[PDB]
A paper describes a structure:
The trimeric spike (S) protein is the major glycoprotein on the [name]-[name]-2 envelope and is responsible for engaging the [name] receptor for viral entry, and thus, it is a prime target for vaccine design and therapeutic antibody development. Receptor-binding domain ([name]) in the S protein plays an essential role in [name] receptor recognition, and mutations in the [name] affecting receptor binding and viral infection have been reported. To unravel the underlying molecular mechanism of the S proteins of Omicron BA.2, BA.2.12.1, BA.2.75, and BA.4/5 bound to hACE2, we determined their atomic structures of the S (BA.2, BA.2.12.1 or BA.4/5) or [name] (BA.2.75) in complex with hACE2 by cryo-EM or X-ray crystallography. According to our previous reports, the binding interface between [name] and [name] could be divided into two patches (patch 1 and patch 2).
Compared with BA.2, BA.2.12.1 has extra L452Q and S704L substitutions in the S protein, while BA.4/5 has extra △69H-70V, L452R and F486V mutations. In complex structures, all S proteins of BA.2, BA.2.12.1 and BA.4/5 (N658S) exhibit a three-[name]-up conformation. Residue N477 of BA.2, BA.2.75 and BA.4/5 [name] forms an H-bond with S19 of hACE2, while A475 engages S19 with an H-bond in the BA.2.12.1 [name]/hACE2 and BA.2.75/hACE2 complexes. N487 in the [name] of BA.2 and BA.4/5 interacts with both Q24 and Y83 of hACE2 through H-bonds, but it only forms an H-bond with Y83, and its interaction with Q24 was absent in complex structures of hACE2 and [name] of BA.2.12.1 and BA.2.75. H34 of hACE2 forms an H-bond with Y453 of the BA.4/5 [name] or S494 of the BA.2.12.1 [name]. Notably, R493 of BA.2 and BA.2.12.1 forms a salt bridge with E35 from [name]. An additional H-bond between T500 of hACE2 and R357 of the BA.2 or BA.2.12.1 [name] was also observed. In contrast, A475 and S494 in the BA.2.12.1 [name] contact hACE2 through H-bonds, which do not exist in the BA.2/hACE2 complex. In this study, we found the binding affinity to hACE2 was also changed no more than two folds regardless of substitution by Q452 (BA.2.12.1 [name]) or R452 (BA.4/5 [name]).
Numbering used by the authors:
A (entry chain A): 19 to 614
B (entry chain B): 333 to 527
Write the structure that this text describes.
Amino acid sequence: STIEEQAKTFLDKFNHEAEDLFYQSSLASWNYNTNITEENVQNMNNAGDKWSAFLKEQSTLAQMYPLQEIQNLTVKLQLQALQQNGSSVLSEDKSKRLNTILNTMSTIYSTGKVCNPDNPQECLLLEPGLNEIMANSLDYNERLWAWESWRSEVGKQLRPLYEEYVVLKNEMARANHYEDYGDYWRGDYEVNGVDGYDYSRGQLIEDVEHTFEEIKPLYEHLHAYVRAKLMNAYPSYISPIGCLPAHLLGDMWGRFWTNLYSLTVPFGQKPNIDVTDAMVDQAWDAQRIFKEAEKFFVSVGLPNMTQGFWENSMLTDPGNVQKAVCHPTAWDLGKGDFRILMCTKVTMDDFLTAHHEMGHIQYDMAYAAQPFLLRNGANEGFHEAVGEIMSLSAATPKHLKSIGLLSPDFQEDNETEINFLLKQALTIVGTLPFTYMLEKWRWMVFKGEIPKDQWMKKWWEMKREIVGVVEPVPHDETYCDPASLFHVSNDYSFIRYYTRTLYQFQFQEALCQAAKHEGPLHKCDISNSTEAGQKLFNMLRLGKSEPWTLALENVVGAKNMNVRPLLNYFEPLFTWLKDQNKNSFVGWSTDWSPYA
Amino acid sequence: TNLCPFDEVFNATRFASVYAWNRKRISNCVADYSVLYNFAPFFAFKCYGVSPTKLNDLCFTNVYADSFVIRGNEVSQIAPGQTGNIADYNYKLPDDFTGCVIAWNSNKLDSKVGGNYNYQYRLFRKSNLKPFERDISTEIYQAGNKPCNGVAGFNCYFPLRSYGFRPTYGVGHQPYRVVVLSFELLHAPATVCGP
Ligand SMILES: *[C@@H]1O[C@H](CO[C@@H]2O[C@@H](C)[C@@H](O)[C@@H](O)[C@@H]2O)[C@@H](O[C@@H]2O[C@H](CO)[C@@H](O)[C@H](O)[C@H]2NC(C)=O)[C@H](O)[C@H]1NC(C)=O
Ligand SMILES: *[C@@H]1O[C@H](CO)[C@@H](O[C@@H]2O[C@H](CO)[C@@H](O)[C@H](O)[C@H]2NC(C)=O)[C@H](O)[C@H]1NC(C)=O
Ligand SMILES: *[C@@H]1O[C@H](CO)[C@@H](O)[C@H](O)[C@H]1NC(C)=O
Ligand SMILES: *[C@@H]1O[C@H](CO)[C@@H](O)[C@H](O)[C@H]1NC(C)=O
Ligand SMILES: *[C@@H]1O[C@H](CO)[C@@H](O)[C@H](O)[C@H]1NC(C)=O
Ligand SMILES: *[C@@H]1O[C@H](CO)[C@@H](O)[C@H](O)[C@H]1NC(C)=O
Ligand SMILES: *[C@@H]1O[C@H](CO)[C@@H](O)[C@H](O)[C@H]1NC(C)=O
Ligand SMILES: [Zn+2]
């Protein structure tokens, strides 16, 4: 009996013991997220402890079959996913210290409160409060006060924790035969083995840099336009050849520029397309929305929803009887159980979120046949890139006229198209530089390129060079600005958003080519196109069984992340912005500062 | 007239696990096959070697009825010349099979909240199973080179596992009850005959 047969038998036992334990954990978690009761929390915790214990015990057994002995490229993937040690490589005291540091950072971010000067009886938390001031207030001193407060109390309480967090997360990575904790994160994109379809962990940096070197013109033109439209609201605070202050971007950190649509709308007389009043005057409910989404998915060839979906799922707010968590989620409990939790309301936003969650559920239904450890997406960005493209086709005016929610005599003028494109760009295009900046800074900190005493200096030098935003007041080494964000204080990866943004438009262009759509890409609808549904299902059914380089080729035809499809989506806006910025300055200078 | 006892086979209160499946020799009685058309939802009524319509006016010597409970995804493994976990270690049918295979859903009876752990199936066996063979051994499976000596651990597994039936699983994982009819004719006088 060679080693491979023994590995196959061990995997056969694991696949039966894991499904049952995971189902009991998932059902307990669902019951907790529907109700709220001291009993349900206890049941959740007990089941979670059982599942964690089962995984902890089984990894020790799997570290007795050497990896090089197996040549199957499917058993190796499953054993590799079990053989990671994690934080167990460290000593007990160091592990306890790391857990304490993480818990302290989480609990200091969660309950951070800021108090206005000379008034202790009025203090604000993060949500709500400070998030409403920097989303709707047009005063300048009100925004700067909140921006400085959040990084004065909460920001400065995390740097001593963060330094030790870094030094301790480097030891765990180095004990796992990596270079640094940054290389550990880049391991989700590593493919070793199958010839031609190989991806190294260091190639991701080059790919990201190459892709970002092409988005710079469109981002520059958008930045110049927003700068021109922001001088009219703050007359004597913004330089016509300078950089945008960091507290005037509609959010605490500047992640999204959505809340600038009121100030930067191209044509204010013409309103956007809202079908909220149409839905109410036709007497629609949540059930109608979900059946419409299902009917949309069946046209492209994908299957129906299970009979258990319509019975075991929550689609309406229970009311005062129950206390639930109103966060739209898609559940795959295992063993054929699929459910959606969503407090649905009659609004176009919920109409699109229904399509999004149903796309998640369809992707889950596709790979049910694979083994347990290969029941995920190709990588961390495929899943919600697949989910997102379904919402793009559901909001186009062509689709809305077909289902009758929009009048059949409504004509699509060329002035609303610019509105739609700019609204989409303020959310999709305005966050890529921020994502790239933050991930680059975190990667450089872990490697050791940024010394311990030049963190904020390089952080603010990178923002004036990549994103284009300058600080309103000076900051020194006593501050920890990056830790002020949720994804940094809590140990989370951040490049998934970048990869998802670039993947979704590649997928959309491939499907629109398959659907024989002629015209601009942003009017596209893949409805009633059976060919465009087989192509997608040729990728949804694989899961992690094959490298993500091959799964992309089954849809797009290329084997690498590409940016040209994103630019084809924004061509009319790019031309309009080039015409509009003929009498302005495009670019920025890294010398001007508001405090100078 | 004495009708064959097809009532107590299909409509039994409790069924048997796959690895220890019951067999009833129905003999020397007249058999009415219209009774079988009750229980209207049949997930499968595939017949081999005969046709359901003319089954009445062709009569045999001995008829065997075998009963057990499987999951939905494994119903396709009870056809002749199939390969799978159940068809190779639990219940195997010959390639020259004559008879019918009947399966109907039993979610409302065999699934309980919390789980029904009384149904078991074999997962590990040394070699494949010859047709119409029944194994009830519970010896430790040795998957390595180190003798097990009647314990469990590294490369020494427990052969039988248990289903976890619940009333919330999908159609493919819900319980199904299967009854298989085998028709034997031989030079010994024919006894079981229809109307
Ligand atoms: C998707 O197709 C349905 C079905 O319409 C038929 O199939 C199409 C492929 C095409 O060949 C149509 O001409 C066929 O009639 C469309 O539903 C129909 O839409 C028309 C709109 O003119 C309407 O008059 C019918 O009543 C609809 N039939 C129904 C609802 O049963 C649907 O509009 C198509 N969606 C698209 C193109 O986005
Ligand atoms: C996970 O940790 C275990 C031990 O905690 C590692 O197993 C040891 O690996 C070293 C490497 O040479 C051997 O010398 C030891 O004999 C192994 N066993 C023990 C008990 O120490 C294992 O390699 C780690 N996982 C990975 C992927 O490296
Ligand atoms: C969960 O909510 C249901 C709905 O009202 C209720 O009947 C049940 O008692 C709740 N669970 C517990 C443990 O009380
Ligand atoms: C790997 O093992 C699986 C076992 O399910 C087998 O189907 C597959 O063909 C093997 N791969 C190769 C390349 O033979
Ligand atoms: C989906 O369900 C509807 C009604 O339940 C049915 O008419 C349709 O045929 C189903 N689609 C498929 C592919 O079975
Ligand atoms: C829209 O169409 C009109 C019609 O002539 C044209 O003048 C205008 O340049 C077009 N583009 C925009 C952005 O209005
Ligand atoms: C099955 O058995 C039950 C209980 O004895 C009985 O009520 C029912 O009528 C039987 N079904 C048929 C088809 O005879
Ligand atoms: Zn989602």
